Design a protein around this ligand. Structure first.
Ligand code: HEC
Length: 81
């Protein structure tokens, strides 16, 4: 839609599952949900999201979304998933 704000990207996109924790989704704010992700790194997730997990659409429900906004959307929450 528009990647003018990393907040607006997660709050428009990662806002159906991760907001409340639906479809078994990992919480928008956690430490133990993010710990096992921050063990390997960060980008390891930006690839998974752009790829689409099982319950996730291929491309994190995005289209023209650049790593700057994508990573910023992940890092808004913490710095991993
Ligand atoms: C449902 C409609 C989802 C939307 C929209 C997004 N995500 Fe998601 N995510 C969802 C589920 C059910 C899960 C599975 C949890 C698991 O067991 O792996 C996830 C997982 C992720 C992960 C991986 C977490 C892990 O521990 O491996 C990441 C990195 C992640 N999701 C990021 C992410 C972002 C940034 C999204 C918006 C661009 C997004 N997800 C949308 C369900 C859904």
């Amino acid at each position: 839609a528009d990647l003018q704000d990393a907040e607006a990207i997660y709050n428009k996109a990662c806002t159906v599952c991760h907001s409340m924790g639906v479809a078994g989704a990992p919480k928008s704010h956690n430490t133990a949900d993010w710990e096992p992700r921050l063990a390997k790194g960060v980008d390891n997730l930006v690839k998974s999201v752009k790829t689409g997990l099982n319950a996730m659409p291929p491309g994190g429900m995005c289209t023209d979304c650049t790593d700057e906004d994508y990573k910023a959307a992940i890092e808004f929450m913490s710095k991993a998933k």
